[PDB]
Ligand binder design. Structure first.
Ligand code: E2V
Ligand code: PLM
Lengths: 194, 97, 146, 217, 389, 49
């Protein structure tokens, strides 16, 4: 909070000064994440907000419809900021049968390394084998739960299915951190700024 | 500097040539090609410092170019393109006329 | 404003839908902008920003800085692909005479070296703006394995 | 106030009739790699009617395309399908006569055209007088020499320039057939001042003086 | 009658530049190796290498540098864009060098988009006549762009029209069941490793041989890479020493996918640019073709939309504030006049002369057929001032 | 100790325009409430417990 005695207009300069002062010092913090949230509070004006209530459907498809709404809204004459709320970010837990894992002699960390090496490979690439532009594309990278449920291992590693070793928990929403609700019913609002 | 790299005993320490083909460095598939009079070359664009008095920067530049030519080594062909000093000269001439 | 962004190969559709779409949507909120020209390639994303021809000059750098800010934070969400704003402004505005140095039967390396020596000797001139070469060559080294 | 626009010109194109071939696929159809366009949700091509017009025909390509697309299905035995496209009008298109094997003189322009005099290049014309270039000063008492140094053109420009105190010309016309495009090795006709310039050979005039001061840093 | 005849008076926003320089651009039908671009380049070069007014000519394969802030520049469209700059002696049209080049390219290979260009004075406008068509679906916007160009080609005063990114690319789709892999002693890990060793090997540290840096890259043996034909029935080796033919693969086939798109305003779109013929101005042609094309546009789902891409947009944007500013100054000068005078009668009297002056401005313009110049759109106000004086 | 509170992190996934980061973890039949976390027969990497 700066002193309420300075003139306006130069406020961005002060913000830039802050960003500068923290940029350099950033090289000293530990491996924890860090990022300046708002050099300025853009959340100043907001027109009418709109809640899209629904039940018995995919929150994913709900957000998708809201995004389609944003795209169609862009057609309006003047538009400031458009921000959603209470979004959902599904995660995927992978519980391991530690007892059986140890029984097999291996550890899940090795499985992690193998999956990392498998995902870090792009399944496509330009080749231009002939005069015309050509490219190859395969279907082997992880994209869903089933896309990883059938992953094997080495011979000396007892190549087995993930299900045969661990429990591939279906993706689900994590413990909430911000919830929106209209008339006592869950919904998803959309604030628009002029 | 890398062709004679060894390995461990249990790793059958061998020369890279004895294992792989050390392809000599070479230029990659081009992405931007320049060419003068149908012949490959390398151009160099120079900009006049902001606020610099034009019609003189080019004079000193061509003079320095003459000296560079005096020092140009073998197999080097200097070719000037877009001598705007002359363009501006003719322009202002016709204008004042 | 030109904003380039590479990627180590991926399906063009996914490439755009992931990097280009996010960049465009995030930058859309920026004020005083008019045109957002997208450009996609097998592994390249390019953004063209055109502001409205109704604003005064002088403050243009402020808008550029705003763009840099808007993308700096959001950078922490893209995948492991490379990313870097090409030109916050187009310095390529004025250019005096250009000079081609033709040669054959020699090292392109030594050619570029001579050009660099030329740049050093040129610095001695009274006034100088930008000095940029073209068609440079970057030799690589393939290592094929048996 | 009002003028007359020029006549219409059929968009030039080079097509080719349909000829069933057994190119490894019974009655398969082959064509260059630049004769395929996607229509709707499937590949297709353009067929030309006998009455100077173009139409679209959907195809079903199954055979691989190694610079030559090979399809099977949806063909018209003896039909002039396009093999050059990418910019034609989909609904209809008045096409230009593609009957000549190469309606463009490009089939012979690569060798010779015949219009006017030829261009210029270093090695055939006289360069303008310029200050003496710091010579390559590669002379060493002597053998092999990199092919880049010597710039023998039709045997009339042997690197005769002597690497001595004057950069003069000499009678060194020795020509060894051991031309591996990497290095020239000779057993006779060699001396200490036998070496020559590397790149500035053809771009240099015989007997031209040089300067000992060389650029280095 | 003057105000009446004003209708057919043609307008143009900017003339060209008398600079003796000229440029020419080429675009290949589909994306290929840059080698093909260089091939067409060298052929055209060999064609023009000895003639009068032909000197100081350079090429550009993949990108065109910038001389002045006059034109724009296609940044990186190597596989679809090229440039050739030429310098004339006194006039590019002295001997109609541009026309000779047009005939040359005409006699040249077909399906090679080409366009001549004399430098233009003023804000960049790209092609003189363009059109943008939108669509959230690829095939839909494509077929609609085609159905639009069809009606657009009605008037023959246009040389040729060219769509944008309207061609697909030969894509290769491959996938494995992974069952035979573990059956033969292969894991997904080694699968991806091999797949990488076939396209682009792993990356290693760079080297510092000089002020520059060279990054070395690994790769498998090349006796198994380079051409698709040899990539058929490949006896791929296994990390376990074994080698089995590619028979264990599946769905390996050819597909089509356009490698170039334009998500203008986060939405796919196509830009159709067209050359001209005769001597009319793009504005007049647009006005003429406005109704029919408008109806065509109306005959399409609402989610789609068409817009112009020529120069009318820029002209209108420039003259935007003019209309919203000039009347105020008009009343300002009117009051200024009223200061010297003292009766509205004399005011209207001298004011009557102001509009009537539009007689000569058009009488000395119609026979010459000179388009209405923007500069004139400005100077007419000065004319009003002096006549009122 | 990590497998008991928050398992190790792995690569994310690209199922759509969004990204989902998958996380590993040990069996949950040993986590969830403090009461059950009393007198835990923790297993060892050597198979013992
Ligand atoms: C730009 C415009 C067109 O130029 C023309 O001259 C068009 C006429 C065709 C050429 C015929 C010339 C007529 C001969 C005149 C008789 C002798 C004169 C010789 C000169 C004497 C000097 C000594 C040598 O020129 C113009 O400025 C006139 C254009 C105005 C008409 C535009 C038409 C638009 C629609 C008109 C509506 C007509 C309404 C009545 C119903 C038919
Ligand atoms: C519409 O653009 C009309 C086309 C006809 C143009 C003919 C040339 C007109 C020039 C008039 C000059 C008259 C000179 C008389 C000298 C006695």
């Amino acid at each position: 909070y700066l002193k309420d005695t300075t003139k306006a207009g130069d406020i961005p300069d002060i913000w830039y000064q802050v960003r500068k002062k923290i940029s350099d010092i950033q090289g000293e913090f530990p491996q924890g994440i860090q990022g300046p949230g708002f050099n300025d509070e853009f959340g100043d004006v907001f027109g009418s907000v709109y809640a899209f209530t629904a039940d018995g459907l995919d929150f994913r498809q709900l957000r998708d419809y809201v995004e389609k709404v944003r795209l169609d809204i862009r057609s309006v004459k003047d538009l400031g900021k458009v921000q959603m709320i209470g979004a959902q970010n599904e995660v995927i837990y992978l519980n391991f049968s530690t007892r059986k894992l140890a029984a097999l002699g291996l550890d899940q960390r090795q499985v992690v390394q193998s999956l990392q090496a498998q995902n870090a490979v792009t399944p496509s690439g330009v080749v231009e084998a002939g005069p015309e532009r050509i490219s190859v594309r395969t279907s082997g990278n992880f994209r869903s739960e089933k896309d990883l449920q059938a992953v094997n291992l080495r011979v000396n590693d007892r190549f087995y299915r993930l299900s045969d070793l661990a429990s591939i928990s279906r993706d689900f929403v994590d413990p909430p951190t911000s919830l929106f609700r209209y008339k006592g019913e869950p919904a998803i609002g959309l604030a628009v700024a002029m | 500097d890398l062709q004679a790299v060894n390995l461990r005993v249990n790793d059958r320490f061998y020369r890279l040539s004895d294992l792989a083909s050390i392809s000599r460095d070479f230029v990659d598939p081009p992405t931007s090609l320049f060419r003068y009079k149908g012949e490959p070359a390398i151009g160099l664009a120079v900009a006049m410092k902001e606020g610099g008095n034009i019609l003189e920067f080019g004079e000193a530049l061509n003079a320095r170019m003459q000296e560079i030519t005096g020092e140009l080594p073998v197999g080097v062909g200097v070719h000037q393109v877009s001598n705007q000093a002359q363009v501006v000269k003719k322009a202002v001439g016709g204008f004042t006329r | 404003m030109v904003i380039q962004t590479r990627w180590p190969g991926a399906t063009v559709d996914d490439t755009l839908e992931q990097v280009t779409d996010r960049i465009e949507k995030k930058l859309e909120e920026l004020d005083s902008l008019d045109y957002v020209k997208s450009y996609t390639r097998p592994g390249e994303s390019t953004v063209f920003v055109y502001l409205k021809d109704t604003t005064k000059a002088g403050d243009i750098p402020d808008i550029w800085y705003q763009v840099r800010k808007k993308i700096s934070d959001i950078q922490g969400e893209f995948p492991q692909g490379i990313q870097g704003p090409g030109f916050n402004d187009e310095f390529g505005d004025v250019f005096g005479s250009v000079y081609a140095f033709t040669a054959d039967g020699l090292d392109f390396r030594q050619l570029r070296d001579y050009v660099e020596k030329v740049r050093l000797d040129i610095r001695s001139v009274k006034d100088l703006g930008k000095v940029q070469m073209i068609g440079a060559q970057n030799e690589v080294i393939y290592l094929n394995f048996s | 106030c009002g003028a007359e626009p020029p006549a219409e010109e059929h968009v030039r194109v080079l097509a080719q009739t349909v000829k069933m071939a057994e190119f490894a696929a019974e009655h398969s159809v082959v064509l260059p790699w630049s004769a395929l366009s996607k229509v709707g949700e499937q590949p297709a091509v353009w067929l030309l009617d006998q009455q100077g017009k173009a139409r679209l025909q959907p195809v079903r390509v199954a055979r691989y395309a190694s610079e030559k697309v090979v399809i099977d299905g949806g063909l018209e035995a003896g039909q002039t399908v396009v093999t050059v496209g990418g910019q034609l009008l989909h609904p209809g298109q008045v096409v230009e006569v593609a009957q000549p094997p190469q309606p463009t003189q490009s089939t012979a322009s690569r060798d010779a055209v015949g219009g006017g005099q030829p261009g210029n290049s270093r090695g055939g014309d006289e360069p303008p007088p310029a200050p003496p270039r710091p010579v390559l000063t590669v002379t060493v008492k002597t053998s092999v020499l990199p092919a880049s140094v010597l710039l023998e053109r039709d045997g009339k420009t042997q690197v005769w320039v002597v690497d001595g105190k004057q950069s003069s010309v000499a009678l060194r016309e020795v020509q060894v057939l051991s031309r591996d495009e990497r290095q020239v090795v000779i057993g006779q006709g060699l001396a200490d001042g036998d070496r020559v310039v590397r790149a500035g050979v053809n771009s240099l005039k015989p007997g031209q003086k040089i300067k000992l001061d060389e650029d280095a840093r | 009658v003057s105000l009446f005849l004003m209708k057919f008076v043609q307008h143009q926003f900017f003339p060209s530049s008398d600079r003796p320089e000229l440029l020419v651009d080429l675009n290949l039908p589909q994306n290929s190796s840059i080698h093909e671009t260089r091939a067409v380049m060298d052929r055209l070069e060999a064609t023009l290498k000895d003639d009068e007014d032909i000197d100081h000519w350079s090429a550009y394969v993949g990108e065109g540098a910038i001389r002045f802030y006059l034109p724009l520049d296609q940044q990186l469209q190597n596989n679809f864009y090229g440039q050739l700059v030429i310098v004339t002696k006194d006039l590019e049209a002295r001997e109609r060098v541009a026309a000779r080049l047009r005939d040359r390219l005409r006699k040249d290979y077909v399906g090679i988009s080409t366009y001549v260009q004399p430098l233009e004075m003023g804000p960049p406008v790209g092609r003189p006549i363009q059109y943008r068509v939108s669509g959230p679906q690829i095939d839909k916007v494509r077929e609609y762009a085609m159905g639009l160009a069809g009606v657009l080609d009605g008037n023959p005063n246009i040389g040729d029209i060219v769509y944008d990114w309207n061609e697909p690319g030969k894509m290769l789709k491959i996938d494995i069941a992974q069952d035979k892999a573990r059956q033969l002693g292969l894991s997904s890990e080694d699968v991806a490793q091999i797949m990488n060793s076939v396209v682009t090997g792993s990356a290693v540290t760079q080297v510092r041989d000089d002020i520059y840096l060279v990054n070395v890259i690994g790769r498998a043996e090349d006796s198994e890479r380079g051409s698709l034909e040899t990539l058929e029935s490949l006896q791929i080796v296994t990390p376990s020493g074994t080698s089995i033919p590619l028979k264990a693969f599946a769905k390996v086939s050819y597909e089509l996918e356009q490698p170039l798109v334009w998500r203008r305003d986060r939405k796919p779109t196509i830009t159709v640019k067209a050359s001209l013929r005769g001597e009319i101005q793009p504005t007049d042609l647009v006005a003429r073709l406005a109704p029919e094309v408008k109806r065509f546009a109306d005959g399409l789902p609402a989610n789609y939309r068409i817009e112009v891409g020529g120069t009318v947009e820029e002209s209108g944007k420039a003259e935007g504030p003019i209309a919203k500013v000039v009347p105020l100054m008009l009343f300002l000068m009117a009051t200024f006049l009223m200061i010297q005078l003292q009766s509205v009668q004399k005011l209207f009297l001298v004011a009557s002369v102001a509009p009537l002056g539009l007689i000569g401005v058009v009488a000395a313009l119609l026979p010459t057929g000179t388009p209405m110049g923007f500069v004139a759109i400005l100077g007419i106000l000065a004319l009003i001032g002096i006549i009122i004086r």
